[PDB]
């Protein structure tokens, strides 16, 4: 199925307890690595990362992260100067890639300032999309170094995917498993003359699930309320969908379709 690898960076100027810099990695919804300006160490966040990557890996990336921390500190100072901003502001980065079930791939690299899009890299055109004049100033400086754009295209298309395939093998017993959902339909008259139908699912992995309500075997036109896909705390997830009023709930998960006729 579809899998992804992502790395985030968070920089905070003048932090109140809160680290000045944090960086976390993820494979799908699972945290794999962490670093912050307090520990100043890159550490695993999944036992399958810890057991398959030698101490030299964590040692080398600890040094790189100490450098990337200093880079974030200085870029955020320059951004605050450009905007004429004082006090506490945030700077964020997200880099990563996706390996789609059809073998095709995606790659992304983006920055945010104070939690809003700032610069979005387009690896297919080798350009940065800027949201305002300050972002345009930065885009011009970054686009002036042709080699760094080519390096970034290669990292997103080749290195990121190779790292993702490596980690999928290390964590295959967690990441490639399937735990089917337990699904039920609850019926209840709520406000006089208003019957609510809930289709509730839990105990499933991966978190991706499709739930819908059908009427006489065809697509609905009335309002469907959707519950978020939430972690249950044991590595599995839960979700629900509801309607008010022949109804049937349809659930699709990991290549298995299920129908619950009311």
């Amino acid at each position: 199925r579809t899998h992804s690898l992502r790395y985030f960076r968070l920089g905070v100027s003048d932090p109140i307890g809160v680290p000045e810099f944090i960086s976390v990695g993820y494979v799908d919804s699972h945290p794999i690595t962490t670093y912050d300006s307090v520990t100043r160490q890159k550490e695993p966040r999944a036992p399958w990362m810890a057991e398959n990557l030698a101490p030299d890996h964590w040692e080398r990336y600890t040094q790189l992260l100490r450098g990337w921390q200093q880079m974030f500190k200085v870029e955020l100072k320059r951004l605050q100067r450009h905007y004429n901003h004082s006090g506490s502001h945030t700077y964020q980065r997200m880099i990563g890639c996706e390996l789609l079930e059809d073998g095709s791939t995606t790659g992304f690299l983006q920055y945010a300032y104070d939690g809003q899009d700032f610069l979005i890299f387009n690896k297919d055109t080798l350009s940065w999309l800027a949201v305002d004049n300050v972002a345009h100033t930065i885009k011009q400086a970054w686009e002036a170094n042709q080699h760094e754009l080519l390096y970034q295209k290669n990292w997103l298309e080749e290195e990121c995917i190779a790292w993702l395939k490596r980690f999928l093998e290390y964590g295959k017993d967690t990441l490639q498993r399937t735990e089917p959902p337990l699904v039920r339909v609850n019926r209840k008259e709520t406000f006089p003359g208003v019957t609510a139908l809930f289709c509730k699912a839990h105990g499933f992995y991966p978190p991706e699930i499709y739930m819908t309500w059908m009427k006489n075997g065809e697509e609905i036109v009335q309002e469907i309320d959707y519950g978020d896909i939430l972690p249950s705390g044991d590595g599995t997830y839960q979700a629900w969908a509801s309607i008010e009023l022949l109804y049937s709930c349809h659930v699709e998960h990991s290549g298995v379709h299920m129908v619950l006729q009311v």
Partner: antibody, heavy 109, light 114 residues
Framework: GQNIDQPTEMTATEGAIVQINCTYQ??????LFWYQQHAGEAPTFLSY??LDGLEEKGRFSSFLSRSKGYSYLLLKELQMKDSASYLC??????????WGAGTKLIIKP | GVTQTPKFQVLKTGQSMTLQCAQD?????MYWYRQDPGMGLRLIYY???????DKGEVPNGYNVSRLNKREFSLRLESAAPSQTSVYFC??????????????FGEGSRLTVLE
């Protein structure tokens, strides 16, 4: 990170063309560099390739084939001042530079 | 660019020595290499940014100090004949970047004699 191979030495004639090959076998790839180092002097950056193709900088061109794990440094209209050592270096998955032993280039007048 | 001292040095076995290196290019990453015949450059120690250092491939018999953003000194604790070599300091704008090249110092030729 593992192995870089380039010839120890090459000889060509003034005015002609020379191609210096560099083959690499590494754990990941983040780019290939060429440096020039004159006898008793410091190495100086010549070129960088990370995607497939040929980049020309005056009389020097650097080629890369990612699928073959192969690069070459092409020097045209050879001059006596081109006599030097040429170093090939690859950045692996952890951004460490893997250095080749260098190619001593001798130009015959 | 990169200012490395001394250019030449004769040492007796057991003598201590410090190589200096300074760059005023506002670079964050600094490196100490040794160059020996028939082999590729070998990293001794490096400093990815001010306030951090780590071993390279051949750290034994050496130590470093990233004194400030500009300076990275290399120390030979007890000079040994195996340390006879040409030492190069280098710097780059950052580390953990692909395209950034190295800027090298002029080189320090050390000869260690009994």
């Amino acid at each position: 990170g593992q192995n870089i191979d380039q010839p120890t030495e090459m000889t060509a004639t003034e005015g002609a063309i020379v191609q210096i090959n560099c083959t690499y076998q590494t754990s990941g790839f983040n780019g290939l560099f060429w440096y020039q180092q004159h006898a008793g002097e410091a190495p100086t950056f010549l070129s960088y390739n990370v995607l497939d193709g040929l980049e020309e900088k005056g009389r020097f061109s650097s080629f890369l084939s990612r699928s073959k794990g192969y690069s070459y440094l092409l020097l045209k209209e050879l001059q006596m001042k081109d006599s030097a050592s040429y170093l090939c270096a690859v950045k692996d998955s952890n951004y460490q530079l893997i250095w080749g032993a260098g190619t001593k280039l001798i130009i015959k007048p | 660019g990169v200012t490395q001292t001394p250019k030449f040095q004769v040492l007796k076995t057991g003598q201590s020595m410090t190589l200096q290196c300074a760059q005023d290019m506002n670079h964050n990453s600094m490196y100490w290499y040794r160059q020996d015949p028939g082999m590729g450059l070998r990293l001794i120690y490096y400093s990815a940014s001010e306030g951090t250092t780590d071993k390279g491939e051949v750290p034994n018999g050496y130590n470093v100090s990233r004194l400030n953003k500009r300076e990275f000194s290399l120390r030979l604790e007890s000079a040994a004949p195996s340390q006879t070599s040409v030492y190069f300091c280098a710097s780059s704008v950052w580390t953990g970047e692909g395209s950034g090249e190295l800027f090298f110092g002029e080189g320090s030729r050390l000869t260690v004699l009994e």
